Design a binder for this molecule. Structure first.
Ligand SMILES: CCCCCCCCCCCCCCCCCC(=O)OC[C@H](COP(=O)([O-])OCC(O)COP(=O)([O-])OC[C@@H](COC(=O)CCCCCCCCCCCCCCCCC)OC(=O)CCCCCCCCCCCCCCCCC)OC(=O)CCCCCCCCCCCCCCCCC
Ligand SMILES: CCCCCCCCCCCCCCCCCC(=O)OC[C@H](COP(=O)([O-])OCC(O)COP(=O)([O-])OC[C@@H](COC(=O)CCCCCCCCCCCCCCCCC)OC(=O)CCCCCCCCCCCCCCCCC)OC(=O)CCCCCCCCCCCCCCCCC
Ligand SMILES: CCCCCCCCCCCCCCCCCC(=O)OC[C@H](COP(=O)([O-])OCC(O)COP(=O)([O-])OC[C@@H](COC(=O)CCCCCCCCCCCCCCCCC)OC(=O)CCCCCCCCCCCCCCCCC)OC(=O)CCCCCCCCCCCCCCCCC
Ligand SMILES: CCCCCCCCCCCCCCCCC[C@@H](O)O[C@H](CO[C@H](O)CCCCCCCCCCCCCCC)COP(=O)(O)OCC[N+](C)(C)C
Ligand SMILES: CCCCCCCCCCCCCCCCC[C@@H](O)O[C@H](CO[C@H](O)CCCCCCCCCCCCCCC)COP(=O)(O)OCC[N+](C)(C)C
Ligand SMILES: CCCCCCCC/C=C\CCCCCCCC(=O)OC[C@H](COP(=O)(O)OCCN)OC(=O)CCCCCCC/C=C\CCCCCCCC
Ligand SMILES: CCCCCCCC/C=C\CCCCCCCC(=O)O[C@H](COC(=O)CCCCCCC/C=C/CCCCCCCC)COP(=O)(O)OCCN
Ligand SMILES: Nc1ncnc2c1ncn2[C@@H]1O[C@H](COP(=O)(O)OP(=O)(O)O)[C@@H](O)[C@H]1O
Lengths: 459, 98, 56, 49, 122, 55, 320, 347
């Protein structure tokens, strides 16, 4: 695992020793090389995980997330360099350093064998994101957004720390292998109920769960493009990964402790899909769609079936890629017209046809068109829910209908109709933007040929 | 215990309450501090004499010496406060808040 | 002719050297977990006439 | 260029630089010798070599 | 609240008892020593940055002294820490040996004869 | 009604309001040693009775 | 051995260098009076170091190379356009006044450091004590606002109280019509626009506030326009003065040590000039501040500490 | 003040603290406290002004009252047992007096009122000394008598200290009062674990002292004592502001910074003793300290506040006096989390 971590660390002195006009080129090239190297972790053994050492291990769940992070870094660099052109060399190097530190913390988080190290890195991811949002955000609400993002996370995460140290004291270990092999049932008691809550609420708020999701629109809208990319693509999946790791020791309590969370997730996915229908800001719609998809992931994790975990893993990967692509698409238009209002710029298909094609493909993947992996995950989760209870199909179908509705609503509003007359500064699409959209979309379609790479350990 | 021990302990308690409750003059509180020291001296001397612990017969003298140091410190501070305000009232010392 | 281009492009070796060093450290870490080599009931084997270890 | 004293002039303080380098070298040599003695003592106490 | 300060035969201010010499000294390439050296290098770089000097190249002798001092202190810190953990384990094992009636060895049952409750997931 | 008003009201806005009120209560002292030492006497009387009588 | 507590403890003292000829002297006067020539002559006769009047670019003369910097990187004010448009809505007038007060504070610190370190005396043209006459003249002419005067007063109250006033205050007296006549005979087109009311306000401020104030803690020597050309007579008048009035005789080694610690470390001297009082005339926004700071850092010898800029020929950087 | 006199007074303060450290006799510990206070009073008044005089007077009154209570407790303990050694007090009433006395000396709630005012009324160097060195002696005394303390009173005072520190720091614009409330909260955290493990208290003391030294030195380097004055440092010394922001994040206890390790170790040690509720409340309350640290970081480094015209003149001057240990303190305040197992050397 050091063969991935050490080059990521080497990215720091390499970008701090580069010339003022070569930082983007060097960082992009070596980030792509690191992603290529990290692609070798997909070879999984089946029966058990790849245990490199006492500190790190790789699973069929961790490997797609690691590859997604390593692949997302170069796309973040490509998206960032346009709006940072006027910045000084030192501040651009600091921004790239923030991105590299975030990547390092993420790659170490997904491979830790022990839960305290996972917690330490999972909290350490906060600082670079907070710095990025509050320093390179564009509006004045970035400060309030950063405060929300920090405190919503910490209020859930601190009880997790207390629960983890208590569990290590009572059991003697927190190593995930020992945790799994020496699992014992949780009795029906108030102490066990509060232990369950302390082990669950941090990952709940990172998803986010409906009712604890208010930080996400603020943080995702007010962050720069790279910050939004990493928030939607990767940082939302930390909660799901933590849930999959932690629910091993929570049985059989989850059988009834999951009822309020399932109810909240289903009704709130309906609510957020409905909210997307009346939104004046283009980024907030994407944020709320992310909330709905993560609510579906929460249901999948809560029901505790192999098909549910497979669908949840597929949906996490697909949602990460699709949300990153949608955020980049919105950012291109924002850079054109310097406003996030959806109806300001209309009929962009007449002026930008290839970008309209990218918009159409992203909208089609957002509504989970077959045989894309988005629908693979969603269908697996829906089938698992149907096995859990036949009445879930009503809510699943309603959510599907509303998702198609607002996806095509966004597409029609932004791309169709007639152009706004007074707006006359819409230049032809750059090679960088088209390449960024292609690099987002092509892995999505290529993953359809080999769906088992992202289905997870339960495959 | 002897009832004199209770009398000396209540003397200490009364002097402590007098220090803790403040009237206008700073000087009154310094006298309460000196009274607490006097009660401590009396109590320690009685305890040492009763048990015939020979070597601590010098301890109350050290207590008195550091009492004199405390009194000198308090008087110097009172001098500076009164030079600042022309009065040793405690309510003038309110430039700093919490 | 190569002095200046080396001085301005030497940064392109840091990441490959880090990769090589990481692989080397991974092998060293593997070297510390040989307690059960050729000792598992499933994979215990008779050594070949010339081989010294089952894996390294 | 500069108008006044500029206590760091074109030449560096050779006394301070020499003292710093000597301190570093002495510390490194002392550490090496200490480690060698520690290894030898540990071997002799437990009967390894 | 004070576990090992009152341990018998503890000299007050040694920082390294003679019994610690029976333990293997940490290797000079110990990753903790490398981290101490990295901390010293960071201290040197921050010193250069604060004094408005070229961060990477200004003080080479000063950075060398920083790294050397950090490594030198860290070596002895690691020695003391390892010795303290060795003492903890030694005392624990001695106490376990001397009190068998508080740490009994009960026969362990195989899983075919231990009855576990099954909780179906549905 | 829900995201912009009531979900805001319950978790974050209530916390902000409560902490602001408590901070205003705690930090707004007049800087007079008379009140502080009166509170010190009250605290001493409590510790000797509600704690020193319970052992 | 840089001067500090260690230097004061072993050996170094200030009073051992005072030799009755230190005598901080300021030669004040109205606009275009011959105070500069008189001050230079006094410095040459008495053997004291002469300080030309602190301008917009005085700080430039003492740091880096003595060359002045660009106006937007140093000062950000123009005396010529104050004469042209004193009532401009860009705040140039009070910005100029505050920058000039800061420059005079820096020059006073430098002069006091020189006198306390070498014992040799200094001669100044104007000072922080007489800087307020221009402020009052600007305020009475409607050139600045009341808030600007209040901010100036706050800065002066927190800054000028840390230093000792000059021993000798020399005032060159020239009537306002003679001042105007010298102004037209000079030749500067901008100074042609100086009205009689402005010069009258400066002179009234001098004669009603400055001289009566300094006469309580310093000794004042007034000289008319005609009798100011006799440098020998003025020096003889100074040489027969008994400095038994101000706080200078009340100074011992400890106060001198505190003052010498304060006069060096120019950042501590200038500390209270940039107090967070947000007057529009002097407040600069984040974007402009960032741009100007970056441009200043791009100056050839300003990126690093003095002895660490290799592009101006510094050597042995890797061993410094 | 004569530099020789200042050196003598600082050495006398340190020698009184060391006398408290090395004494086996209660009278010698009392003498050390008396000498420390006597030499400490002038240091608060080095720069003369009415605010400094008021701060020194309040400090003297509080510490003299605490010393009187200390001596009275020592005398009660002697009365009920002819013992002078500091091993374990034999009377519950004397021990309660001792605890109240040491808490008043440390400034624990509800004896916290003097700390913010005294800290605000003095200079930054005196504030550094007061908030770093003055905590060693009472904490050492409390460590020696840890087995005798009543857990209820100590834990109540610690929880009150944490809560009041957070709430008071929420309302401050002066930097010295912010640091004083931060100190109160950190003292509460330290005294929460003392009845269970004194090594944890020592580790928390060391880390808090390192962070406080780094923060005070950074505040001296950028000579500001208010939020708006510190808002100007970005236009003159951006590196100082960046280091300040990182140190503030470390003081908030965020991983992977150093300030997180004492809270982590205290929480796990308390959970070893079946104490779950109180550490949870403690962390949830330290969230407030993190909030006002983040507010200071917003105003200081993450955004750029408007500046003044005279800053251009300051651009041309370097710092005449340099702090030698500032670089080391910053590194220890931030990057020492991986070296956690070294805490075994503290016991
Ligand atoms: C199914 C047909 C099979 C054909 C075989 C060959 C297909 C090769 C295509 C490769 C993938 C396309 C890449 C997408 C990026 C867009 C490229 C672009 O920018 O155009 C530039 C290029 C230059 O044109 P231009 O004149 O310069 O101006 C273009 C203007 O911008 C505006 O031009 P435009 O308005 O014409 O827009 C361009 C085009 C491109 O935009 C797209 O949306 C095309 C992508 C389809 C939707 C993607 C998400 C939906 C989920 C499906 C995931 C399938 C993945 C399978 C593996 C893929 C491997 C990469 O849009 C459309 O044509 C309409 C989209 C409607 C597609 C409906 C299909 C639904 C599912 C059909 C079956 C899928 C599974 C196959 C097996 C089933 C069981 C046997 O235009 C093209 O070449 C058009 C692309 C060809 C259309 C492909 C549609 C079907 C292919 C789907 C995947 C292929 C599966 C192969 C497996 C075997 C079967
Ligand atoms: C976890 C695993 C490992 C991770 C490592 C830990 C993280 C990194 C290490 C941290 C400590 C190291 C660096 C600290 C000293 C640097 C101080 C500094 O300011 O840098 C300036 C300096 C650039 O200035 P310059 O070159 O003198 O000329 C430009 C002018 O000075 C123009 O400069 P200026 O001063 O005029 O520019 C003004 C600027 C000045 O503001 C700054 O420069 C920011 C400096 C903050 C100091 C960092 C805090 C102390 C360390 C704690 C780190 C916490 C990490 C945990 C995660 C939390 C993230 C905050 O202010 C601003 O623009 C406002 C920015 C405010 C935004 C908020 C972000 C600031 C805090 C971010 C800190 C992130 C960590 C450090 C990243 C690296 C920074 C250099 O940076 C460097 O050139 C040195 C960087 C490292 C180079 C050495 C590499 C060795 C060479 C290769 C050998 C290969 C070794 C292996 C062998 C392999 C075989 C081949
Ligand atoms: C372990 C626990 C963790 C660490 C503990 C917590 C650390 C907190 C320490 C704060 C110290 C405060 C301080 O010194 O200045 C603050 C200072 C900030 O001040 P600043 O802005 O730089 O400028 C202040 C100027 O000094 C402005 O003042 P100035 O202009 O007057 O400059 C005078 C300057 C320059 O100094 C001189 O001029 C030298 C001239 C020598 C004069 C000769 C006088 C000798 C005669 C007196 C003898 C008395 C003996 C006592 C007898 C007792 C009998 C029982 O002297 C000083 O600044 C103070 C000198 C400090 C003396 C240190 C010597 C150690 C004494 C040990 C006593 C123990 C004896 C045995 C005890 C046995 C038990 C009973 O902080 C720092 O500079 C960095 C912090 C460093 C802290 C230590 C680092 C951590 C540990 C390594
Ligand atoms: C906006 C989104 C925020 C996040 C949402 C988080 C959801 C948290 C809710 C937790 C789910 C249930 C918690 C515990 C399960 C059962 C609770 C209780 O009502 O059930 C009965 C419990 O009986 C009583 O109801 C006791 C609970 C009554 C007191 C609780 C107050 C509930 C009021 C709602 C307050 C809102 C809480 C959330 C604040 C935000 C069962 O009867 P019994 O079999 O005998 O007890 C079983 C436990 N035993 C085995 C230990 C004996
Ligand atoms: C922020 C990180 C903390 C930094 C701490 C300051 C570092 C600089 C200190 C300089 C090192 C010298 C100190 C000690 C050297 C000789 C003195 C020695 O004899 O002391 C012995 C003891 O040794 C010292 O205590 C060990 C000091 C080592 C401190 C490092 C631990 C930090 C925790 C983990 C963070 C890693 C830090 C990385 C290093 C930079 C005496 O033992 P004893 O008299 O019986 O114990 C007294 C306390 N009792 C009785 C109550 C138990
Ligand atoms: C018992 C005590 C428990 C302690 C719990 C502390 C929770 C930590 C959050 C601290 C929030 C503090 C907010 C505050 O004090 O002021 C509100 C603040 C005041 O503005 P200032 O910046 O200070 O001044 C500007 C004008 N000059 O007003 C605001 O707008 C606040 C905006 C950000 C609020 C963020 C709140 C996020 C909370 C998320 C939910 C969880 C919070 C923690 C409690 C969880 C529930 C048990
Ligand atoms: C930003 C919003 C996120 C909010 C999430 C907050 C919820 C976190 C879950 C509860 C936190 C506290 C959990 C405590 C840690 C668990 C450790 C444990 O299991 O110990 C229990 C201790 O259990 C407790 O003490 C729990 C009591 C609760 C203390 C604090 C209550 C605060 C409010 C609790 C309800 C809210 C939690 C869910 C709300 C989610 C957000 C709305 C039993 O230990 P023993 O004493 O040894 O018992 C067995 C031997 N006799
Ligand atoms: N504090 C000030 N405010 C405004 N203008 C000033 C100030 N100080 C000097 N000046 C300008 O300096 C110019 C000439 O300086 P002055 O000493 O009067 O003549 P000379 O060069 O003959 O000595 C004048 O136009 C005057 O306005």
């Amino acid at each position: 695992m050091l063969k991935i971590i050490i080059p990521t660390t080497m990215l720091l002195p390499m970008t701090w020793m580069s010339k003022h006009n070569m930082i983007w080129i060097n960082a992009t090239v070596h980030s792509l090389l690191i992603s290529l190297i990290s692609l070798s972790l997909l070879n999984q053994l089946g029966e058990n995980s790849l245990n490199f050492s006492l500190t790190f291990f790789s699973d069929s769940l961790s490997a797609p997330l690691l590859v997604l992070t390593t692949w997302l870094l170069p796309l973040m660099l490509m998206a960032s360099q346009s709006h940072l052109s006027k910045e000084t060399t030192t501040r651009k190097k600091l921004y790239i350093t923030m991105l590299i530190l975030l990547q390092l913390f993420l790659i170490m988080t997904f491979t830790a064998t022990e839960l305290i190290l996972f917690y330490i890195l999972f909290e350490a991811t906060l600082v670079p994101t907070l710095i990025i949002i509050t320093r390179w955000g564009n509006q004045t609400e970035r400060l309030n957004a950063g405060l929300y993002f920090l405190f919503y996370t910490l209020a859930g995460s601190l009880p997790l720390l207390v629960a983890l140290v208590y569990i290590q004291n009572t059991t003697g270990s927190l190593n995930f292998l020992i945790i799994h092999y020496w699992s014992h049932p949780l009795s029906n008691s108030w102490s066990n109920i509060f232990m369950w809550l302390a082990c669950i609420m941090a990952f709940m708020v990172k998803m986010p769960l409906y009712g604890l999701h208010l930080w996400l629109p603020k943080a995702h809208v007010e962050a720069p493009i790279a910050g939004s990319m990493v928030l939607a693509a990767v940082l939302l999946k930390l909660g799901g990964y933590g849930m999959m790791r932690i629910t091993t020791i929570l049985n059989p309590l989850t059988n009834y402790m999951a009822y309020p969370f399932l109810m909240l997730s289903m009704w709130g996915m309906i609510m957020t899909s409905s909210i997307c229908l009346r939104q004046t800001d283009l980024k907030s719609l994407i944020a709320y769609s992310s909330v709905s998809h993560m609510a579906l992931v929460i249901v999948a994790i809560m029901i505790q079936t192999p098909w549910s975990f497979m669908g949840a893993t597929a949906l996490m990967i697909a949602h990460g890629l699709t949300s990153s692509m949608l955020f980049c698409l919105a950012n291109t238009n924002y850079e054109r017209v310097h406003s996030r209002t959806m109806i300001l710029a209309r009929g962009l298909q007449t002026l930008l046809p290839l970008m309209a094609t990218w918009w159409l493909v992203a909208s089609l993947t957002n509504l989970a068109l077959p045989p894309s992996i988005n629908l693979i995950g969603e269908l697996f989760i829906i089938t698992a829910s149907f096995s859990w209870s036949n009445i879930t199909i009503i809510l699943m179908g309603m959510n599907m209908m509303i998702t198609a509705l607002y996806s095509l609503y966004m597409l029609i509003t932004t791309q169709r109709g007639k152009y706004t007359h007074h707006i006359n500064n819409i230049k032809p699409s750059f090679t960088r933007e088209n390449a960024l959209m292609a690099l987002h979309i092509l892995p999505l379609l290529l993953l359809t040929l080999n769906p088992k790479m992202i289905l997870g350990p339960l495959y | 215990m002897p009832l004199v021990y209770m009398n000396i302990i209540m003397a200490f308690a009364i002097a402590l309450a007098g220090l803790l409750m403040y009237r206008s003059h700073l000087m009154s509180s310094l006298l309460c501090l000196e009274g607490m020291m006097l009660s401590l001296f009396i109590m320690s001397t009685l305890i040492i004499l009763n048990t015939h612990f020979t070597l601590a017969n010098m301890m109350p003298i050290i207590l008195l010496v550091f009492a004199a140091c405390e009194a000198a410190l308090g008087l110097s501070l009172l001098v500076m406060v009164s030079n600042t305000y022309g009065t040793d009232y405690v309510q003038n010392l309110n430039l700093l808040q919490c | 002719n190569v002095l200046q281009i080396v001085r301005d492009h030497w940064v392109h070796i840091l990441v490959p050297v880090g990769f090589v060093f990481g692989c080397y450290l991974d092998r060293r870490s593997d070297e510390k977990l040989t307690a059960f080599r050729n000792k598992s009931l499933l994979f215990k084997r008779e050594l070949r006439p010339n081989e010294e270890v089952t894996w390294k | 260029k500069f108008y006044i004293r500029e206590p760091p002039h074109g030449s560096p303080d050779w006394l301070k630089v020499g003292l710093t380098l000597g301190t570093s070298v002495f510390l490194w040599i002392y550490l090496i010798k200490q480690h060698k003695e520690d290894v030898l003592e540990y071997k002799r106490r437990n009967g390894l070599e | 609240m004070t576990m090992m300060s009152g341990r018998p035969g503890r000299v007050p201010l040694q920082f390294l008892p003679n019994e610690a010499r029976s333990l293997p000294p940490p290797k000079l390439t110990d990753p903790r020593l490398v981290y101490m050296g990295f901390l010293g290098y960071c201290s040197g770089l921050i010193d250069n940055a604060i004094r408005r000097r070229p961060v990477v190249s200004a003080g080479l002798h000063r950075q060398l002294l920083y790294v050397t001092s950090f490594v030198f202190f860290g070596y002895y810190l690691l020695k003391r820490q390892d010795y303290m953990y060795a003492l903890r384990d030694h005392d624990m094992f001695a106490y376990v040996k001397s009190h068998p009636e508080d740490f009994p060895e009960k026969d362990k049952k195989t899983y075919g004869e231990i009855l576990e409750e099954f909780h179906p997931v549905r | 009604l829900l995201d912009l008003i009531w979900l805001e009201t319950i978790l974050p806005k209530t916390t902000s309001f409560i902490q602001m009120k408590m901070s205003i209560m705690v930090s707004n002292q007049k800087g007079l040693i008379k009140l502080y030492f009166l509170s010190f006497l009250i605290t001493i009387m409590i510790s000797m009775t509600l704690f020193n009588y319970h052992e | 051995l840089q001067y500090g507590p260690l230097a004061f403890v072993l050996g170094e003292r200030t009073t051992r260098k005072l030799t009755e000829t230190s005598k901080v002297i300021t030669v004040d006067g109205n606009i275009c009076s011959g105070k500069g020539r008189l001050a230079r002559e006094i410095a040459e006769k008495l053997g004291l170091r002469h300080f030309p009047e602190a301008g917009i670019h005085y700080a430039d003369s003492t740091t880096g190379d003595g060359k002045p910097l660009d106006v937007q990187l140093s000062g950000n004010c123009s005396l010529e356009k104050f004469y042209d448009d004193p009532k401009s809505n860009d705040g140039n007038s009070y910005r100029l006044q505050s920058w000039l007060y800061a420059s005079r504070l820096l020059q006073y610190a430098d002069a006091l450091e020189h006198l306390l370190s070498t014992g040799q005396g200094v001669v100044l043209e104007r000072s922080i004590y007489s800087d307020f006459v221009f402020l009052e003249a600007m305020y009475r002419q409607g050139f600045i606002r009341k808030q600007c005067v209040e901010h100036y007063n706050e800065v002066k109250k927190v800054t000028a109280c840390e230093y000792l006033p000059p021993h000798v205050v020399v005032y060159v007296d020239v009537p306002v019509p003679e001042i105007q006549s010298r102004i037209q005979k000079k030749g500067n087109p901008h100074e042609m626009k100086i009205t009689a009311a402005y010069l009258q306000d400066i002179e009234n401020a001098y004669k009603k506030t400055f001289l009566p104030e300094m006469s309580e803690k310093c000794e004042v020597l007034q000289y008319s326009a005609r009798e100011a050309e006799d440098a020998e007579k003025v020096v003889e008048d100074i040489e027969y003065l008994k400095c038994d009035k101000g706080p200078w005789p009340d100074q011992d080694d400890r106060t001198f040590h505190r003052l010498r610690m304060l006069v060096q470390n120019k950042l501590e001297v200038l500390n209270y000039t940039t107090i967070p009082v947000y007057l529009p005339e002097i407040t600069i926004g984040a974007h402009q501040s960032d741009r100007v700071f970056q441009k200043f850092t791009e100056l050839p010898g300003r990126k690093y500490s003095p002895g660490y800029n290799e592009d101006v020929g510094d050597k042995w950087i890797w061993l410094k | 003040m004569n530099p020789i006199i200042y050196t003598t007074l600082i050495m006398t303060v340190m020698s009184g603290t060391m006398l408290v450290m090395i004494s086996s006799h209660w009278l010698l510990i009392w003498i050390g406290f008396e000498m420390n206070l006597l030499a400490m009073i002038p240091v608060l008044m080095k720069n003369f002004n009415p605010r400094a005089t008021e701060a020194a007077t309040k400090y003297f009154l509080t510490q003299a009252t605490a010393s009187m209570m200390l001596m009275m407790a020592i005398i009660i303990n002697l009365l009920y047992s002819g013992q002078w050694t500091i091993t374990k007090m034999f009377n519950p009433v004397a021990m309660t007096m001792m605890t109240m006395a040491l808490a008043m000396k440390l400034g624990l709630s509800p004896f916290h009122f003097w700390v913010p005012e005294v800290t605000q009324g003095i200079s930054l160097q005196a504030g550094l000394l007061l908030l770093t060195w003055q905590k060693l002696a009472p904490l050492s005394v409390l460590c020696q008598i840890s087995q005798s303390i009543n857990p209820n009173l100590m834990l109540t005072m610690a929880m009150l200290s944490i809560l009041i520190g957070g709430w008071g720091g929420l309302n401050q614009t002066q930097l010295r009062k912010i640091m004083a409330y931060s100190s109160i909260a950190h003292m509460g955290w330290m005294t929460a674990v003392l009845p269970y493990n004194t090594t944890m208290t020592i580790l928390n003391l060391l880390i808090y002292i390192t962070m406080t030294l780094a923060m005070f030195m950074l505040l001296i380097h950028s000579s500001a004592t208010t939020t708006l004055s510190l808002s100007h440092t970005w236009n003159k010394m951006p590196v100082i502001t960046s280091l300040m922001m990182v140190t503030l994040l470390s003081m908030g206890g965020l991983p992977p910074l150093s300030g997180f390790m004492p809270k982590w170790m205290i929480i796990q040690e308390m959970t070893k003793n079946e104490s779950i509720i109180m550490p949870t409340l403690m962390a949830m309350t330290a969230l407030l300290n993190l909030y006002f640290y983040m507010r200071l970081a917003y105003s200081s480094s993450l955004t750029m506040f408007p500046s003044t015209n005279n800053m251009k003149m300051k651009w041309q001057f370097e710092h005449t006096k340099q702090m030698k240990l500032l670089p080391t303190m910053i590194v220890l305040s931030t990057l020492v989390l991986p070296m956690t197992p070294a805490l075994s050397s503290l016991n």
